[PDB]
Amino acid sequence: IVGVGMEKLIISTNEHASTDQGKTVSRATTNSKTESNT
Amino acid sequence: HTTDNSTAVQDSNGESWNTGLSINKGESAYINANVR
């Protein structure tokens, strides 16, 4: 007579986690011209 | 009465960096055992 007894249960949560970080550098140059007539 | 015409050119450049890291909560590591 053979039986099976369970002692404890363990749960493995199939989950995916990500982490991102970044840096940015920029530089803009503008040379405007205007010819006003009145 | 006034009338003007505006002309301009805009120039710019960019540069960026990134770093990431991903993990699985179900299988986070693998174990190896040296036995005799």
Residue numbers in the entry:
A (entry chain E): 299 to 336
B (entry chain F): 359 to 394
Question: What does the study report here?
Answer:
Some bacteria express a binary toxin translocation system, consisting of an enzymatic subunit and translocation pore, that delivers enzymes into host cells through endocytosis. The B-components of the C. perfringens, C. difficile, and C. spiroforme systems bind to the host cell’s lipolysis-stimulated lipoprotein receptor (LSR), after which the A–B complex is internalized by endocytosis. Then, the A-component is translocated via the B-component pore across the endosomal membrane into the cytosol, assisted by host-cell chaperones, including Hsp90 and Hsp70. In the cytosol, the A-component covalently transfers an ADP-ribose to actin, causing F-actin depolymerization, cell rounding, and eventually cell death.
Here, we report two cryo-EM structures of the CDTa-bound CDTb-pore, long and short, at 2.64- and 2.56-Å resolution, respectively. We solved two structures of CDTa-bound CDTb-pores: one with a long stem and the other with a short stem. The former contained one entire β-barrel stem; however, the final map calculation showed that the tip of this stem (residues 337–358) had very weak density; therefore, we modeled the structure with a partial β-barrel stem, excluding residues 337–358. Thus, both the long and short structures have partial β-barrel stems, lacking β-barrel tip residues 337–358 and 332–363, respectively. The most striking difference between the structures was that D4II (receptor-binding domain II) was observed in the long, but not in the short complex. Between the long and the short structures, the definitive difference is that D4II is clearly visible in the long form. That is, after stem formation, D4II is stably fixed around the stem. Domain 4 is the receptor-binding domain at the outermost region of the pore, with two sub-domains, D4I (T617–L741) and D4II (T757–D876), joined through a linker (N742–P756), as seen in the long-form. However, the two overall structures were similar, including a 1:1 binding ratio of CDTa:CDTb-pore. In both the long and short complexes, CDTa was bound to the cis-side of the CDTb-pore through its N-terminal domain.
